[PDB]
Nucleic acid binder design. Structure first.
Ligand SMILES: Nc1ncnc2c1ncn2[C@@H]1O[C@H](COP(=O)(O)OP(=O)(O)O)[C@@H](O)[C@H]1O
Length: 641
RNA sequence: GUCCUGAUAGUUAGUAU
RNA sequence: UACUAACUAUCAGGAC
């Protein structure tokens, strides 16, 4: 059951938004989704009506795939309207005009990603004259060449009576580092782009009392890294000798070995960093994993790096002999096993999480890390430590979550996630049987997670938005926010925290009424260096400078050729300097042999290589359409056998 | 499970003016 | 302040 009775500030915000374009700024849990749903319900009298003579429909936009299901479910639950869902997996590329028209006629509210909406707009399937309300989710992304900004260019050229109402939702207006004197400039730029107003609640005290009364308490904890033990210094000396002999080999290096020797250099640096930050046991684990993963890579490699791997195995042997020698006397020595930072983290856990476990209360906690290897190793260590049936560690169950779709061009990284397993892990966390989670900045925003009693910043935030979001994650009663900082950087972090506090104070000051943008402010929209290509006038499909290379690559890919060869186009550059005293770049392009066009194509002289490439792609698109490889809708020809 | 193309954010070096 | 080259974290769209 939802809160049928709205709060007074919700009603005030709805009344304000019904009049003009507005952007709502509120903290998490205020209920911005409820406001959006209510606004959709209010204007429901313009939606019903056939689409073949001038009907209108309402659109919703999001950033990530999982949010589609959440928002569709919320809308379907709270109100009784037909709702559709569309993402990039159903192969919506191959649809024709008739299928799109049928879908538009059948539904009343649509929820799709931004890229799909842009693709629909560019190819002439909708003219933006049949939209009654358009909603931006996480509106603070509209900067530079983001799809949100490219959508507004079509809004720019419309008439006065065709303009649909625009609404946006956000939590932090700024999205990057900003000294306290640039906040007004950033806010004005954002307001100019979206052509709306930034407003907040006039009863923010009531909102804070009702919901934000669970505001977390900040605690700063310091640690010192110059407390290495005898094992640490012994291993450090071992790596020192190893890097000395490696430098000797680099002095005696030759061709086809400098790259290999640099690979050994980076491996040794990684090992040293892991040992310094985490401790000896993690170094042992990483060395063993590196051996087991390089076991498969032994084939078709030069003998010199086999010898290097042999000496690496020798250092493995000596270090494991030393580790066993101490283990014969350590008997699971906690202080020697881990670095000082891990000891401090363990102390914090005992101080707060175990103490809460002593009381009859539920436990939920998250740990934020920067890299991915660190998250994996921390989960391994915590599980291993809890497995020993310790008195204080028998109630801690740990799992980790890493970003999907984040496959690099290398570093398979020992069971990368890159799949739907995020859904399974999050379902585990919501259901129960998991109190502690390790996350590499992937659950920060736009995901439903349960209330957490404790949040730990194992690493420092990098800008205002990250700090605000991570602070807002914790919402349970008596929640605590903890930041761990080295000793020598305390003053620098204190200055940065003061800056963040000042920015937050200015943002709250913004609560007062603000002047609406003038028409010239909207006219301050920048223009691209070259105009688009409209073959059928202003109402037809277009090709833009920012949507040409991808289209060319798609057309090349759909060519009939061998499945083992992509046959992508190739590019070259030529540089020249003219009397403007700024170096000029001119690009060039060539097509694969399969396409009917075999001729070099040259773009305009452009200041940067990016723009030269874009110009060449645009000219190639022109030449392709003139020949007849693209249909009436500027799509690749869909001829099939 | 592979192989391409775009978008945003932090750091390092060289180079203007 | 603009350009060139490396490293780290996140997202979307089409091929086999
Ligand atoms: N009328 C209401 N007033 C306040 N809170 C409400 C109301 N109706 C529902 N809620 C609750 O507020 C929560 C808002 O969720 P969500 O949209 O994620 O927060 P936010 O809008 O801050 O992102 C919902 O989980 C819902 O249970």
């Amino acid at each position: 059951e939802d809160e049928f009775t709205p709060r007074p500030y919700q009603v005030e915000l709805l009344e304000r938004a019904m009049k003009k374009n507005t952007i709502v700024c509120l903290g998490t849990g205020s209920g911005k989704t409820f406001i959006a749903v209510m606004l959709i319900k209010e204007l429901a009298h313009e939606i019903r009506g056939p689409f073949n003579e001038g009907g209108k429909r309402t659109f919703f936009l999001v950033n990530t795939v999982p949010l589609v299901n959440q928002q569709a479910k919320v809308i379907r639950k709270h109100t009784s309207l037909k709702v559709g869902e569309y993402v990039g997996d159903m192969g919506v590329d191959s649809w024709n005009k008739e299928k799109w028209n049928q879908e538009f006629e059948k539904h009343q509210v649509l929820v799709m990603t931004a890229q799909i909406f842009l693709d629909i707009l560019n190819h002439g399937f909708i003219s933006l004259s049949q939209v009654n309300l358009l909603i931006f989710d996480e509106c603070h992304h509209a900067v530079k060449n983001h799809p949100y900004r490219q959508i507004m260019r079509h809004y720019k050229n419309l008439e006065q009576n065709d303009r649909p109402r625009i609404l946006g939702l956000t939590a932090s207006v700024i999205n990057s580092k900003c000294k306290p004197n640039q906040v007004e400039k950033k806010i004005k730029e954002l307001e100019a782009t979206l052509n709306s107003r930034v407003v907040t609640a006039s009863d923010l005290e009531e909102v804070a009392v009702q919901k934000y009364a669970t505001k977390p308490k900040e605690i700063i904890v310091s640690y010192n890294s110059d407390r290495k033990s005898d094992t640490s210094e012994v291993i450090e000396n071992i790596i020192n000798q190893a890097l000395e002999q490696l430098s000797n080999i680099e002095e005696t290096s030759n061709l086809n070995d400098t790259n290999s020797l640099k690979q050994i250099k980076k491996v040794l640096r990684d090992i040293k960093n892991i040992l310094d930050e985490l401790g000896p046991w993690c170094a042992h684990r990483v060395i063993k994993s590196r051996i087991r993963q390089l076991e498969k890579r032994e084939s078709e490699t030069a003998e010199e790096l086999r010898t290097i791997r042999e000496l690496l195995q020798s250092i493995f042997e000596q270090i494991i002999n030393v580790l066993k020698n101490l283990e014969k006397l350590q008997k699971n020595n906690s202080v020697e096993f881990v670095s000082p930072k891990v000891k401090k983290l363990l102390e914090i856990l005992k101080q707060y999480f175990s103490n809460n476990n002593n009381s009859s209360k539920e436990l939920c906690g998250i740990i934020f890390v920067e890299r991915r290897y660190t998250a994996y190793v921390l989960y391994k260590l915590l599980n291993e430590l809890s497995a020993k049936r310790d008195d204080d560690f028998s109630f801690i169950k740990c799992d980790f979550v890493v970003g999907h779709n984040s496959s690099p061009s290398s570093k398979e990284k020992s069971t990368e996630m890159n799949s739907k397993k995020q859904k399974e892990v999050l379902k585990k966390f919501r259901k129960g049987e998991c109190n502690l989670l390790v996350a590499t900045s992937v659950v920060e925003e736009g995901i439903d997670i349960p209330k957490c009693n404790l949040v730990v910043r194992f690493d420092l935030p990098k800008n205002f938005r990250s700090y605000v979001q991570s602070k807002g994650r914790a919402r349970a009663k008596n929640s605590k926010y903890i930041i761990m900082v080295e000793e020598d950087e305390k003053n620098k972090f204190q200055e940065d925290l003061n800056q963040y506090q000042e920015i937050e104070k200015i943002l709250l000051r913004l609560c007062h009424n603000r002047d609406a943008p003038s028409e010239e402010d909207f006219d301050s929209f920048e223009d691209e260096l070259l105009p688009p290509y409209m073959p059928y006038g202003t109402d037809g499909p277009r090709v833009t400078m920012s949507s040409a290379i991808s289209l060319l690559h798609r057309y090349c890919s759909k060519l009939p050729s061998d499945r083992f060869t992509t046959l992508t186009p190739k590019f070259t550059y030529i540089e020249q300097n003219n009397e403007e005293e700024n170096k000029m770049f001119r690009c060039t392009l060539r097509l694969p042999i399969n396409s009917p066009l075999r001729e070099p194509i040259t773009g305009q002289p452009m200041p940067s290589k990016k723009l030269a490439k874009r110009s060449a792609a645009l000219e190639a698109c022109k030449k392709l359409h003139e020949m007849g490889e693209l249909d009436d809708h500027l799509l690749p020809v869909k001829i099939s056998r």
